[PDB]
Amino acid sequence: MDNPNPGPDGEGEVELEKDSNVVLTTQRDPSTSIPAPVSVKWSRWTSNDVVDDYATITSRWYQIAEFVWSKDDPFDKELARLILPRALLSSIEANSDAICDVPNTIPFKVHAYWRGDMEVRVQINSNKFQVGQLQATWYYSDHENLNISSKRSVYGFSQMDHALISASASNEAKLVIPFKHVYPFLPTRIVPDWTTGILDMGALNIRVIAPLRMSATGPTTCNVVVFIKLNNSEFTGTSSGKFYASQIRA
Amino acid sequence: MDNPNPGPDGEGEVELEKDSNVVLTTQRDPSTSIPAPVSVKWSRWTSNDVVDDYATITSRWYQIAEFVWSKDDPFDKELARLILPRALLSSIEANSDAICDVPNTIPFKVHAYWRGDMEVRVQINSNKFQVGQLQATWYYSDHENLNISSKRSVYGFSQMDHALISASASNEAKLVIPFKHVYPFLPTRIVPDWTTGILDMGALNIRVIAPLRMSATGPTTCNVVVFIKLNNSEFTGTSSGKFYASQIRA
Amino acid sequence: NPSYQQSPRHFVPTGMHSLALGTNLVEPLHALRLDAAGTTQHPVGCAPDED
Amino acid sequence: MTVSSIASRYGLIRRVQWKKDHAKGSLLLQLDADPFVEQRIEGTNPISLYWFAPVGVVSSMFMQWRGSLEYRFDIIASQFHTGRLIVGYVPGLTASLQLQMDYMKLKSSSYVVFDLQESNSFTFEVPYVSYRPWWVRKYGGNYLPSSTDAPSTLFMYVQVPLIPMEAVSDTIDINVYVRGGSSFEVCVPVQPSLGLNWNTDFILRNDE
Amino acid sequence: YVQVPLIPMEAVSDTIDINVYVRGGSSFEVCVPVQPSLGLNWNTDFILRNDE
Amino acid sequence: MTVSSIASRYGLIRRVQWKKDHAKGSLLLQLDADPFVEQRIEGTNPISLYWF
Amino acid sequence: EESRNTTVLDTTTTLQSSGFGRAFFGEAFNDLKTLMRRYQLYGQLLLSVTTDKDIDHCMFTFPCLPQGLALDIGSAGSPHEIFNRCRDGIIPLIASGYRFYRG
Amino acid sequence: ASHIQITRVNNVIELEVPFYNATCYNYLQAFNASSAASSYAVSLGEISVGFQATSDDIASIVNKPVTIYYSIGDGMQFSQWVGYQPMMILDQLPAPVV
Amino acid sequence: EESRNTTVLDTTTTLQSSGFGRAFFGEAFNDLKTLMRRYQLYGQLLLSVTTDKDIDHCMFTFPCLPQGLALDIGSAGSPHEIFNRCRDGIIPLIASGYRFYRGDLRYKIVFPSNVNSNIWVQHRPDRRLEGWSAAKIVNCDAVSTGQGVYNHGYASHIQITRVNNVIELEVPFYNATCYNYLQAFNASSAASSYAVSLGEISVGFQATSDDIASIVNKPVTIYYSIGDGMQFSQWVGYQPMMILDQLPAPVV
């Protein structure tokens, strides 16, 4: 303890998190926050048709959002209300290319129905001299709740369990997000009983709890990037990809 | 034996062949012909990167060619020189839709390299009173052999092992096609050392050994359809689908 | 659903429990208490000195 | 008497004709993959009667159903008839996507090829694919909202067109029978969406 | 109160935020149930009973 | 669901600013020591909502 | 034959049995007999004195059968809306399915 | 066999119509009466409800509703299977039209 | 994280546990579920005949959900003073705190005394709630669908008002869902609409129109409680409250 000896290597240890063929690193301990106990598989109750998780490609980390967080942002200021199963697709399509192009998301192009736990890391690179604090909060099926527009504020997400991202520590926020929804499976396209609100489990949202503060000549911006593993998933109901429609623009 | 008793059911037994979520039937015994002993897996020698067969979707039966076979066709007359890994893709694209649409072929949209045994059934529905006989012959890397244009005739494929499809019996021709190629893996797109001749193991070809013969007022046409399982496969080298190019028109 | 065909008890209604009686006699009530087994209790320093 | 003892009885529900000159792409039927499969009678009545499979009546009494159906197909033909037909199943088709179908899009999802030659009958067993552990009734007591449409759709395209001898008929009948599958099961009891034909009188409440 | 005033470096901010979170303690406990003194914001309509 | 399982969850209830130029005596807050600690929303409503 | 099944073309992987809602709602709906015992509207009327009735006269008489009474929509001017709208019912609908009863 | 509800105490008499017929088991579909003795082969009986009011009091009773219920009573056992006659879908019935 | 506690600065000597009033009043208030079962006012109405109703017509129909009906202050001229004043309640206030539920409800409707007429009560699991608007008691008008009338299959019960004028109920959980929505509901998915209400209860008198005049503008209060089997799921923080003692005075 208390015996620094930086070398060419630098000082601290670097913890990893390999999945399929994607390794990614964080110098800091993740501030994990797990809204629910891990989901039961549930293919048993609602699918004769062939079911298969694609662990070797669906479980890879893949970016879904990135954003500057300048000092100009006022105390309570959303940076990103990401939907999650959708943003994984909506961001790709927003980046002007089809879902089929990206290995993580090809099974969505085909299978009619999805289920499964998600993982979301909200990595940041604030400088050590900056002062601020994001919160990252997952809120299940937000869109279904019409009064959410009033709840959607840092006072209101701090009550449910939520990750904290201090800009001083440049802390990285892990966020396990086990499946919970009124219906056991989320459709990946228009489906006979619903159309609107497709593949929408709920929403990650990253409200600011403390705006960046810095010396007048200090570093203004603080970029953030959000990877999303899609691990214990399972897909069911094989179907042609021509039925698939591009995700709502958001 | 020798005791027919047809009912509403009809007479004979119906043997099946389920795979993933595709069952298909043949009243008759398949005339299997297996060119090579089953392939060793070979991901060991040429792929650090994550490898995964997609048994739950790649192994499904899916049509790749269908063709009328009228009495007008002369003795030695090709009906279809199908390439196989390509025709599985080339037919889909020929049918005016992208590879991503079809569940069997999505992993090709992504993974740079393919390997693995194929299965090909050449089902037919000739009437019992028709007289004729297709041969179905698999010929490894045909395109590499320039003199093949002379070999490509029924006298020349009957020497290597080949399926026979009598039109009298309306026999169905099974055809296991284990991987063999000079290079252990077949690329699914332009690759640094080769471009032309992409994903081309060789060619199935269905020369006629005996033209249909029938009474002048009998049934002229005899349709044929060719399903292709892609079983003990394995894919390697994950890569973006935007690199993929539509298969050569053939 | 077996049917229960045998004759019912034959009781006589009265509007009210006895006002006079006040000893060896359980007296049913619509408690405004939450718990139905609850009853007032005396913490050790609140004990009733006077009998 | 039991919901399963009634569900496990075929009733003829559709009668496809199948002519020689149907090309390889031709549709024969696309009845919905819910018990409420239908066959209207061409009656003179203002309110037309409908045939149902026994599963289609016993399941109208219940709000919700789940599990496999079974469509037996009696392809009525002499052994000298020969042909082949797909009997596919597409999960998650909304009615706007009900069109744009063809057998080749069908092959992408679950399906079953069959070879009419000697044996002339089979029994495709329709899968229950939906996001909902049960599934709500297609119809309802006379109340149009709360009438969810079917989970998925059956299809039966002709994979290889029929090839009859000159001395046998150009056309083959195909009977489609429906039966509650081994796992077919229903839960909540509500108003039947069906009424008996014992009295088909009805009285409009026009205010005029 | 601030027992010893904050002493920032020139290269870091003059101001520090302080969040105050409240939680029922280990021994926090409540007894008698009565009318909530709070109403949901699901409907904030209210109607004065002026007699005029 | 339990009174204690709900009571044992923090919710942000106050956000003090803390500037360098606060002298040693300066007050930052004096919220009451009862659960009903408060943070009014600056809404336009005739009857203002409060966080709890 | 009717219930014969010549050649099953199974595609399904086995689905979990729910026991007819026993595994969810806590109550089996398998036996249709136990549903038959939920009560149903059978008939309906507005009493209509005609003759000057004595103490003994029956006010109305109806046959009592499982089949259900012949459905009475009522006159075109004054429909009994339930039979007009909610046609028949459950018990008659299942009585439709059998040819003899004894109970 | 009979029973007499006192409307003042509780106005819903509950019953148990029993099976009294000299038959194996009764007809269950609609009935057109072929045999003259087939007519005993349907109804369990023929219930009759009647008020004991004198005509002076019977005026209160006029056009007062009397709904009736029924259920098959545990001992019921339908026999031979017979397929359903054509149904008529209910949601397809005509609207009142404004 | 939310419930983390970095460095406790204890000053307290340990306080005696009271067991939530168990040590005083003789009854624990620890479990909030057992308080949830004290009955609450759910809705309220003055019956309003419009069309000349027959024996079969439902008098009113309301969706039955734990969340509580959308609050009905009433018209500015004629407020329902309790919801106007005693905003919402307990059970909806705790329903505010969770995002899913899966369970029964109980009701115990209290009909007007002066009326004698028999009263039937349908439960209708089929019905979808259609957005938070029209999640309220509805006075059904002229029959046009099957919504307005008694129905055969639906579970039902028929109180005799003359014997005791408060039918008590047990609305069960019939949905093809894991568990229903519990906050306010705007209906995103069309199939999300089956994911809220337990059903859609309908109360209806069997009175002929000649007798229905006695019934007009007679109160019918309704109660509810979560029915033992209820189990709210995911925690979700409270939306902003509005303190009640701070509500405006009538002003003389």
PDB file of N, CA and C in Angstrom, chain A residues 159-207:
ATOM      1  N   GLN A 159     -33.830   7.204  -6.884  1.00  0.00           N
ATOM      2  CA  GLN A 159     -34.546   6.402  -5.910  1.00  0.00           C
ATOM      3  C   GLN A 159     -34.488   4.930  -6.287  1.00  0.00           C
ATOM      4  N   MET A 160     -34.638   4.636  -7.572  1.00  0.00           N
ATOM      5  CA  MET A 160     -34.380   3.296  -8.067  1.00  0.00           C
ATOM      6  C   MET A 160     -32.885   3.126  -8.209  1.00  0.00           C
ATOM      7  N   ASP A 161     -32.399   1.894  -8.153  1.00  0.00           N
ATOM      8  CA  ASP A 161     -30.965   1.660  -8.250  1.00  0.00           C
ATOM      9  C   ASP A 161     -30.393   2.102  -9.595  1.00  0.00           C
ATOM     10  N   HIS A 162     -29.217   2.721  -9.546  1.00  0.00           N
ATOM     11  CA  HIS A 162     -28.656   3.399 -10.702  1.00  0.00           C
ATOM     12  C   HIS A 162     -27.150   3.524 -10.586  1.00  0.00           C
ATOM     13  N   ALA A 163     -26.454   3.485 -11.715  1.00  0.00           N
ATOM     14  CA  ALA A 163     -25.008   3.649 -11.716  1.00  0.00           C
ATOM     15  C   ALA A 163     -24.617   5.107 -11.543  1.00  0.00           C
ATOM     16  N   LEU A 164     -23.457   5.362 -10.953  1.00  0.00           N
ATOM     17  CA  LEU A 164     -22.950   6.725 -10.869  1.00  0.00           C
ATOM     18  C   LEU A 164     -21.602   6.851 -11.548  1.00  0.00           C
ATOM     19  N   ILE A 165     -21.459   7.889 -12.355  1.00  0.00           N
ATOM     20  CA  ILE A 165     -20.264   8.086 -13.145  1.00  0.00           C
ATOM     21  C   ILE A 165     -19.620   9.403 -12.757  1.00  0.00           C
ATOM     22  N   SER A 166     -18.768   9.387 -11.740  1.00  0.00           N
ATOM     23  CA  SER A 166     -18.073  10.604 -11.365  1.00  0.00           C
ATOM     24  C   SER A 166     -17.093  10.955 -12.458  1.00  0.00           C
ATOM     25  N   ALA A 167     -17.025  12.228 -12.814  1.00  0.00           N
ATOM     26  CA  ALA A 167     -16.081  12.658 -13.825  1.00  0.00           C
ATOM     27  C   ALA A 167     -14.707  12.855 -13.218  1.00  0.00           C
ATOM     28  N   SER A 168     -14.642  12.936 -11.901  1.00  0.00           N
ATOM     29  CA  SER A 168     -13.355  13.081 -11.246  1.00  0.00           C
ATOM     30  C   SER A 168     -12.562  11.802 -11.370  1.00  0.00           C
ATOM     31  N   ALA A 169     -13.229  10.693 -11.096  1.00  0.00           N
ATOM     32  CA  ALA A 169     -12.595   9.394 -11.127  1.00  0.00           C
ATOM     33  C   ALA A 169     -12.608   8.778 -12.511  1.00  0.00           C
ATOM     34  N   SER A 170     -13.336   9.400 -13.432  1.00  0.00           N
ATOM     35  CA  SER A 170     -13.540   8.848 -14.765  1.00  0.00           C
ATOM     36  C   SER A 170     -14.061   7.429 -14.681  1.00  0.00           C
ATOM     37  N   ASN A 171     -14.906   7.197 -13.688  1.00  0.00           N
ATOM     38  CA  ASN A 171     -15.447   5.884 -13.405  1.00  0.00           C
ATOM     39  C   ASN A 171     -16.299   5.334 -14.532  1.00  0.00           C
ATOM     40  N   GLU A 172     -16.200   4.030 -14.736  1.00  0.00           N
ATOM     41  CA  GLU A 172     -16.988   3.334 -15.741  1.00  0.00           C
ATOM     42  C   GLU A 172     -18.183   2.615 -15.128  1.00  0.00           C
ATOM     43  N   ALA A 173     -19.353   2.759 -15.738  1.00  0.00           N
ATOM     44  CA  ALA A 173     -20.586   2.248 -15.144  1.00  0.00           C
ATOM     45  C   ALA A 173     -21.116   0.995 -15.816  1.00  0.00           C
ATOM     46  N   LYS A 174     -20.928  -0.147 -15.169  1.00  0.00           N
ATOM     47  CA  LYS A 174     -21.522  -1.392 -15.631  1.00  0.00           C
ATOM     48  C   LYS A 174     -22.993  -1.367 -15.299  1.00  0.00           C
ATOM     49  N   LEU A 175     -23.796  -2.116 -16.041  1.00  0.00           N
ATOM     50  CA  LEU A 175     -25.229  -2.072 -15.847  1.00  0.00           C
ATOM     51  C   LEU A 175     -25.872  -3.323 -16.410  1.00  0.00           C
ATOM     52  N   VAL A 176     -25.999  -4.359 -15.587  1.00  0.00           N
ATOM     53  CA  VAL A 176     -26.713  -5.553 -16.008  1.00  0.00           C
ATOM     54  C   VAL A 176     -28.185  -5.218 -16.131  1.00  0.00           C
ATOM     55  N   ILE A 177     -28.827  -5.684 -17.191  1.00  0.00           N
ATOM     56  CA  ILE A 177     -30.230  -5.381 -17.420  1.00  0.00           C
ATOM     57  C   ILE A 177     -31.000  -6.632 -17.833  1.00  0.00           C
ATOM     58  N   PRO A 178     -31.345  -7.479 -16.862  1.00  0.00           N
ATOM     59  CA  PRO A 178     -32.075  -8.721 -17.110  1.00  0.00           C
ATOM     60  C   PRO A 178     -33.444  -8.451 -17.680  1.00  0.00           C
ATOM     61  N   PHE A 179     -33.915  -9.325 -18.559  1.00  0.00           N
ATOM     62  CA  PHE A 179     -35.195  -9.120 -19.204  1.00  0.00           C
ATOM     63  C   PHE A 179     -36.326  -9.123 -18.191  1.00  0.00           C
ATOM     64  N   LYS A 180     -37.173  -8.106 -18.276  1.00  0.00           N
ATOM     65  CA  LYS A 180     -38.480  -8.087 -17.638  1.00  0.00           C
ATOM     66  C   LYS A 180     -39.383  -7.215 -18.465  1.00  0.00           C
ATOM     67  N   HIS A 181     -40.525  -7.769 -18.818  1.00  0.00           N
ATOM     68  CA  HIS A 181     -41.481  -7.077 -19.642  1.00  0.00           C
ATOM     69  C   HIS A 181     -42.772  -7.808 -19.420  1.00  0.00           C
ATOM     70  N   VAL A 182     -43.888  -7.186 -19.753  1.00  0.00           N
ATOM     71  CA  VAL A 182     -45.159  -7.827 -19.524  1.00  0.00           C
ATOM     72  C   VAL A 182     -45.272  -9.103 -20.349  1.00  0.00           C
ATOM     73  N   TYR A 183     -44.698  -9.089 -21.545  1.00  0.00           N
ATOM     74  CA  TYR A 183     -44.709 -10.269 -22.393  1.00  0.00           C
ATOM     75  C   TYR A 183     -43.318 -10.855 -22.437  1.00  0.00           C
ATOM     76  N   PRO A 184     -43.215 -12.178 -22.324  1.00  0.00           N
ATOM     77  CA  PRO A 184     -41.928 -12.851 -22.196  1.00  0.00           C
ATOM     78  C   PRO A 184     -40.978 -12.593 -23.358  1.00  0.00           C
ATOM     79  N   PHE A 185     -41.487 -12.395 -24.567  1.00  0.00           N
ATOM     80  CA  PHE A 185     -40.629 -12.146 -25.725  1.00  0.00           C
ATOM     81  C   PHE A 185     -40.879 -10.807 -26.401  1.00  0.00           C
ATOM     82  N   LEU A 186     -39.806 -10.158 -26.840  1.00  0.00           N
ATOM     83  CA  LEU A 186     -39.894  -8.939 -27.640  1.00  0.00           C
ATOM     84  C   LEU A 186     -39.746  -9.227 -29.125  1.00  0.00           C
ATOM     85  N   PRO A 187     -40.768  -8.902 -29.918  1.00  0.00           N
ATOM     86  CA  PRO A 187     -40.755  -8.990 -31.375  1.00  0.00           C
ATOM     87  C   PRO A 187     -39.763  -8.045 -32.024  1.00  0.00           C
ATOM     88  N   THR A 188     -39.183  -8.439 -33.152  1.00  0.00           N
ATOM     89  CA  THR A 188     -38.199  -7.609 -33.831  1.00  0.00           C
ATOM     90  C   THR A 188     -38.744  -6.938 -35.088  1.00  0.00           C
ATOM     91  N   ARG A 189     -40.042  -7.079 -35.315  1.00  0.00           N
ATOM     92  CA  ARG A 189     -40.707  -6.499 -36.476  1.00  0.00           C
ATOM     93  C   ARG A 189     -42.186  -6.383 -36.185  1.00  0.00           C
ATOM     94  N   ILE A 190     -42.946  -5.782 -37.089  1.00  0.00           N
ATOM     95  CA  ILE A 190     -44.385  -5.720 -36.911  1.00  0.00           C
ATOM     96  C   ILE A 190     -44.948  -7.134 -36.787  1.00  0.00           C
ATOM     97  N   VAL A 191     -45.833  -7.316 -35.818  1.00  0.00           N
ATOM     98  CA  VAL A 191     -46.308  -8.619 -35.370  1.00  0.00           C
ATOM     99  C   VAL A 191     -47.824  -8.516 -35.278  1.00  0.00           C
ATOM    100  N   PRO A 192     -48.555  -9.638 -35.391  1.00  0.00           N
ATOM    101  CA  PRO A 192     -49.999  -9.495 -35.539  1.00  0.00           C
ATOM    102  C   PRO A 192     -50.705  -8.726 -34.446  1.00  0.00           C
ATOM    103  N   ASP A 193     -50.279  -8.805 -33.196  1.00  0.00           N
ATOM    104  CA  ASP A 193     -51.059  -8.068 -32.226  1.00  0.00           C
ATOM    105  C   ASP A 193     -50.457  -6.711 -31.892  1.00  0.00           C
ATOM    106  N   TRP A 194     -49.143  -6.515 -31.976  1.00  0.00           N
ATOM    107  CA  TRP A 194     -48.728  -5.117 -31.960  1.00  0.00           C
ATOM    108  C   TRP A 194     -47.739  -4.726 -33.033  1.00  0.00           C
ATOM    109  N   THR A 195     -47.723  -3.428 -33.307  1.00  0.00           N
ATOM    110  CA  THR A 195     -46.871  -2.830 -34.314  1.00  0.00           C
ATOM    111  C   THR A 195     -45.979  -1.775 -33.677  1.00  0.00           C
ATOM    112  N   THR A 196     -46.612  -0.721 -33.178  1.00  0.00           N
ATOM    113  CA  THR A 196     -45.920   0.407 -32.572  1.00  0.00           C
ATOM    114  C   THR A 196     -45.199  -0.018 -31.300  1.00  0.00           C
ATOM    115  N   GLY A 197     -44.080   0.628 -30.990  1.00  0.00           N
ATOM    116  CA  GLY A 197     -43.363   0.333 -29.766  1.00  0.00           C
ATOM    117  C   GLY A 197     -42.589  -0.955 -29.898  1.00  0.00           C
ATOM    118  N   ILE A 198     -42.134  -1.217 -31.116  1.00  0.00           N
ATOM    119  CA  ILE A 198     -41.444  -2.457 -31.426  1.00  0.00           C
ATOM    120  C   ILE A 198     -40.099  -2.619 -30.720  1.00  0.00           C
ATOM    121  N   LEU A 199     -39.880  -3.814 -30.180  1.00  0.00           N
ATOM    122  CA  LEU A 199     -38.615  -4.219 -29.573  1.00  0.00           C
ATOM    123  C   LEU A 199     -38.121  -3.191 -28.548  1.00  0.00           C
ATOM    124  N   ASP A 200     -39.025  -2.754 -27.676  1.00  0.00           N
ATOM    125  CA  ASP A 200     -38.763  -1.661 -26.737  1.00  0.00           C
ATOM    126  C   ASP A 200     -38.913  -2.094 -25.282  1.00  0.00           C
ATOM    127  N   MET A 201     -37.863  -2.666 -24.702  1.00  0.00           N
ATOM    128  CA  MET A 201     -37.937  -3.145 -23.324  1.00  0.00           C
ATOM    129  C   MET A 201     -38.143  -2.019 -22.327  1.00  0.00           C
ATOM    130  N   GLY A 202     -37.582  -0.855 -22.626  1.00  0.00           N
ATOM    131  CA  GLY A 202     -37.494   0.220 -21.655  1.00  0.00           C
ATOM    132  C   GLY A 202     -36.366   1.146 -22.033  1.00  0.00           C
ATOM    133  N   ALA A 203     -35.905   1.986 -21.115  1.00  0.00           N
ATOM    134  CA  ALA A 203     -34.896   2.956 -21.511  1.00  0.00           C
ATOM    135  C   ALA A 203     -33.826   3.252 -20.477  1.00  0.00           C
ATOM    136  N   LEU A 204     -32.577   3.090 -20.898  1.00  0.00           N
ATOM    137  CA  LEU A 204     -31.441   3.667 -20.206  1.00  0.00           C
ATOM    138  C   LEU A 204     -31.497   5.162 -20.377  1.00  0.00           C
ATOM    139  N   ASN A 205     -31.199   5.900 -19.322  1.00  0.00           N
ATOM    140  CA  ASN A 205     -31.100   7.338 -19.448  1.00  0.00           C
ATOM    141  C   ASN A 205     -30.094   7.924 -18.483  1.00  0.00           C
ATOM    142  N   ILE A 206     -29.342   8.894 -18.986  1.00  0.00           N
ATOM    143  CA  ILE A 206     -28.133   9.351 -18.341  1.00  0.00           C
ATOM    144  C   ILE A 206     -28.274  10.826 -18.005  1.00  0.00           C
ATOM    145  N   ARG A 207     -28.984  11.095 -16.924  1.00  0.00           N
ATOM    146  CA  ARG A 207     -29.226  12.451 -16.487  1.00  0.00           C
ATOM    147  C   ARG A 207     -27.958  12.925 -15.790  1.00  0.00           C
TER     148      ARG A 207
END
